[PDB]
């Protein structure tokens, strides 16, 4: 029986990217113009994109146009779709469809489906960081911990930029949530933890959020 | 090209002939196929270039017309035959399809029973609270839940999912479950899931009270 | 300039698949073998991939042969990485390079490449379910909440098979978090609520895990 | 299979300097050999290929030279923007091997790290997640160890650690390792422990506190 198999599907933020791809079993694909389709939550489906004989025309959907790139592989028997910019409403079971029929002719329905596979992508493009306090315990060393924000970069300056000696700012780590985390700090005279005030300043232009924390001794 | 289906939900009995139609904003000859599709399955082809039926697929199903006016026919529902339809005009590089058609089982009108559960002490010392609202064997399928906490609307923060219809009673149940931090959900007192439905000649609200 | 640019890259699991792509800018791919490089977390880079003019052969290091794919697009100058049953290992940012030179000759350096995407394999490839209650407060309901698993399926049984009337288990739903979650429930006379123990089986056949539960009131 | 190995791993020296890298084939590869420059997270630069050739645009101060086996990579003059990774690469005609790379950075005294570790926040610590940091300031050369323990329980699995650049003003390194833990796992046990070493340390450094003190 002819097979066909989507893979790459998963969980995709607003904006970024996800490629999947098609493979068959007991048919080639080079004679057939090959398709992606989505089955949207509401239950219905939507053509997404064709690639005919020899990659000659490649359509796609007013919806993805602009976004989504459909290619394919004859030799080695794959189709593949690059979306890009995504949107919520791109939510949905992605099917890779053969067009053809027992006898082929220039116009034929998709006699055969992959089993889909699961595409969602999540509302928010970006995700502001929490900041707290590294409280500090001759020389003392406090920061901020700026905690669970995307995509990146966030900036931190401390005391507005009049303190520079002595930061380190490290760069971030992805965390196993899939957001990013970063520490700044500083090392100061200990005799200045009762009198100085030390504020860390945090920018995240992606989600047009700035922090101003004040670490003090807890 | 637009493709209008009707009806949106069928509902009938094991045996009947049922029509579902589609039509086209402009003419399309008779480029056009129908598929079955099984929740969580593929696409099947039934019939194609209007009236053509694919090797294998049952007799009983059939379709007919041109231009811009198409029919589906089921002469004989057999309990395999509840499941979405949809159409599809395709051309030669390009397609679109119907909005499908979901073809259900008919029984009278049931409204749901409803039950809030709150979170379970152990999942509340693990740090989240899962508040889980039941909907049970209602009919029709189409139900609304809102949660309300502290008589404040929640949005994005739920999610449902719905069983197929029972194969006793034609019946379907939802469960939806809110989910909230530890901290959060002990931010607020009173827990309340309200449900609207075809059997109900206004809304229900099951509450409880934090603690 | 000539220019590349890797899109595709994420968070995957052990086991899963990512397929990323490359397309480029200034130059068309056609005549050059295209290549894939990864940078692993100890700072060497390793070669992946590469695939010849035409297709002639797709090559690959010994590390992911038969499991990865390389595909080439030479009409609109894509390539293409598969990226099947992940390790923990494959774990690095992957880059596109083009052999290639000032002057194409028999043998090339990799004279350009795109800046590289990032790609992170998390070691747990599955992960069993947490289990509670769902308490009864005519007929009364209770159940059990299936939470934070993967991947499909769950199975769940009331009393080892024995209450089947009344019984609903619901779909999965994929959380934000991508661990998947569903509720099981029945409705029984409130007279059994003293007598009667009720006890959901739950069982995870990717993770081996079996959890037995009893829901009695509060 | 060529096999390439580059020496030294690590290579240390003043701004003006001339350095060589050494870069050495398992068999011989004649001269199908090519250098590459690249910076922490930006893309690699090719240098030199064919062992000799200098890329159109690539500044004189670099060369290479060797055929066979034994290769080498020559800057005379270090400049501030050479301080990188210098990677050498066989490339035949349908795979490539890299060597493991050659980290040049600029050279100091030995710094032994001065350790520093800081609780969760309360603020933190009331959503539900408990990040406690340990901090290794100031240090040289970048090789360290930071291991955890709770409850005099060496951990595993539960960190993350990222490491700066060499400092613009001092030349040093410095280091945060993150141990995360929910809010109940927490306020389970009492005792935070980060235990480090490091070559400039004659023994472990331990930094510790007790949870509320
Ligand atoms: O999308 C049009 C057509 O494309 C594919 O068939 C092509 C070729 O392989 C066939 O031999 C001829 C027959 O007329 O048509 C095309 O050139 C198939 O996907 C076909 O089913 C489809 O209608
Ligand atoms: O692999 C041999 C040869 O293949 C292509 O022509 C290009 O990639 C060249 O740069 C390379 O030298």
């Known amino acids: 029986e002819v097979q066909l198999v989507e893979s790459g599907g998963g969980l995709v933020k607003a904006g970024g990217s996800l490629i999947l791809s098609c493979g068959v079993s007991?048919?080639?694909?080079?004679?057939?113009?090959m398709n992606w389709v989505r089955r949207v939550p509401g239950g219905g489906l939507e053509w997404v994109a064709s690639?005919?004989?020899?990659?000659?025309?490649?359509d796609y959907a007013d919806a993805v146009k602009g976004r989504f790139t459909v290619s394919r592989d004859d030799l080695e028997d794959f189709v593949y779709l690059q979306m890009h910019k995504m949107r919520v409403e791109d939510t949905a079971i992605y099917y890779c469809?053969?067009?053809?029929?027992?006898?082929?002719?220039?116009?034929?329905?998709?006699?055969?489906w992959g089993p889909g596979t699961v595409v969602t992508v999540s509302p928010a493009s970006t995700k502001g960081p929490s900041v707290f306090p590294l409280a500090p315990s001759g020389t003392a060393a406090l920061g901020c911990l700026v905690k669970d924000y995307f995509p990146e970069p966030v900036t931190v300056s401390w005391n507005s930029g009049a303190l520079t000696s002595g930061v380190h700012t490290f760069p971030a780590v992805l965390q196993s949530s899939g957001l990013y985390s970063l520490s700044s700090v500083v090392t100061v005279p200990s005799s200045s933890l009762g009198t100085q005030t030390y504020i860390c300043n945090v920018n995240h232009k992606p989600s047009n959020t700035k922090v101003d924390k004040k670490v003090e001794p807890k | 090209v637009v493709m209008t289906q009707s009806p949106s939900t069928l509902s009938a009995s094991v045996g009947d002939t049922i029509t579902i139609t589609c039509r086209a904003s402009?003419?399309?000859?008779?480029?056009l196929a129908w598929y079955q599709q099984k929740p969580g399955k593929a696409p099947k082809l039934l019939i194609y270039?209007?009236?053509t039926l694919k090797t294998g697929v049952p007799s009983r199903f059939s379709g007919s017309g041109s231009g811009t006016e198409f029919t589906l026919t089921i002469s004989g529902l057999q309990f395999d035959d509840f499941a979405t339809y949809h159409c599809?005009?395709?051309?030669?590089?390009?397609?679109?399809f119907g909005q499908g058609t979901r073809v259900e089982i008919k029984r009278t009108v049931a409204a749901p029973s409803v039950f809030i559960f709150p979170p379970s002490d152990e999942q509340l010392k693990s740090g989240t609270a899962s508040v889980v609202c039941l909907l049970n064997n209602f009919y029709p399928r189409e139900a609304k839940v809102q949660w309300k906490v502290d008589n404040a609307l929640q949005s994005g923060n739920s999610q449902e999912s719905v069983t197929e219809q029972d194969s006793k009673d034609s019946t379907y149940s939802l469960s939806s479950t809110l989910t909230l931090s530890k901290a959060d959900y002990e931010k607020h007192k009173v827990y309340a899931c309200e449900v609207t439905h075809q059997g109900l000649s206004s809304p229900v609200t099951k509450s409880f009270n934090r603690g | 300039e000539v220019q590349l640019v890797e899109s595709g890259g994420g968070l995957v699991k052990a086991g899963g698949s990512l397929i990323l792509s490359c397309?480029?800018?200034?130059?068309?791919?056609?005549?050059?073998?295209?290549?894939?490089v990864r940078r692993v977390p100890g700072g060497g880079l390793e070669w992946?991939?590469?695939?010849?003019?035409?297709?002639?052969?797709?090559?690959?290091?010994d590390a992911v042969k038969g499991r990865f794919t390389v595909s080439r697009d030479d009409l609109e100058d894509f390539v293409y990485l598969q990226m099947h049953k992940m390790r923990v290992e494959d774990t690095a940012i992957?880059?596109?390079?083009?052999?290639?030179?000032?002057?194409?000759?028999?043998?090339?350096?990799?004279?350009?490449?795109?800046?590289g995407t990032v790609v992170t394999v998390s070691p747990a490839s599955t992960k069993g379910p947490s289990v509670f209650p769902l308490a009864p407060s005519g007929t009364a309901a209770l159940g059990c909440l299936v939470k934070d698993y993967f991947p499909e399926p769950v199975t769940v049984s009331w009393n080892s098979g024995a209450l089947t009337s009344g019984v609903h288990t619901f779909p999965a739903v994929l959380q934000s978090s991508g661990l998947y979650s569903l509720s099981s429930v029945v409705t029984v006379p409130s007279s059994s609520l003293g007598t009667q123990t009720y006890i959901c089986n739950v069982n995870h056949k990717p993770s081996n895990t079996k959890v037995d539960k009893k829901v009695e009131p509060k | 299979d060529v096999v390439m190995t580059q020496s030294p791993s690590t290579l240390s020296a003043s701004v003006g300097d001339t350095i060589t890298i050494t870069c050495?084939?398992?068999?011989?590869?004649?001269?199908?050999?090519?250098?590459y420059q690249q910076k922490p997270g930006k893309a690699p630069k090719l240098?030199?290929?064919?062992?000799?050739?200098?890329?159109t645009g690539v500044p004189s101060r670099f060369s290479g030279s060797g055929s066979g086996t034994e290769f080498t990579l020559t800057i005379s003059g270090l400049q501030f923007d050479d301080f990188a990774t210098?990677?050498?690469?066989?490339?035949?005609?349908?795979?490539?091997?890299?060597?493991?790379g050659t980290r040049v950075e600029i050279k100091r005294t030995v710094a032994a790290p001065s350790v520093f570790i800081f609780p969760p926040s309360d603020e933190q610590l009331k959503s539900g997640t408990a990040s406690v940091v340990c901090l290794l300031n100031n240090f040289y050369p970048r090789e360290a160890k930071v291991q955890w323990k709770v409850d005099n329980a060496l951990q595993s699995g539960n960190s993350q650690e990222s490491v700066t650049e060499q400092d613009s003003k001092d030349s040093t390194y410095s280091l945060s390792s993150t141990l995360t833990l929910s809010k109940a796992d927490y306020e389970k046990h009492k005792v935070y422990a980060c235990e480090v070493t490091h070559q400039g340390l004659s023994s472990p450094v331990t930094k510790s506190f007790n949870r509320g003190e």
């Open positions: 007991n048919f080639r694909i080079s004679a057939h113009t």
């Open positions: 402009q003419s399309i000859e008779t480029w």
């Open positions: 690639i005919s004989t020899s990659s000659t025309y490649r």
């Open positions: 270039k209007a009236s």
């Open positions: 599809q005009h395709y051309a030669g590089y390009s397609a679109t």
């Open positions: 469809a053969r067009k053809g029929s027992d006898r082929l002719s220039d116009n034929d329905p998709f006699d055969a």
